[PDB]
Symmetry: none
């Protein structure tokens, strides 16, 4: 005997992603 | 006796996208 | 009696990288 318990709680949200890559070169002076 | 532990919970959601990258380098010249 | 609850689901994947940064500032005066 013995029935399986309830499904566990859902996991936490993943960590925020890393910053995007550096931007492109700026305009000429 | 009591049954076995339940199944693992649903996997968490993907994280938020990261922030914008740093500004680009200065334009020419040297 | 029913069994204990299953373990918590695993944490989700990490977010993707953010957008590329903006354009850099103007170059130095000639």
């Amino acid at each position: 005997p013995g029935p399986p318990g309830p499904p566990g709680i859902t996991g936490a949200r993943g960590l925020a992603g890393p910053p995007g890559p550096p931007g492109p070169p700026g305009p000429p002076g």
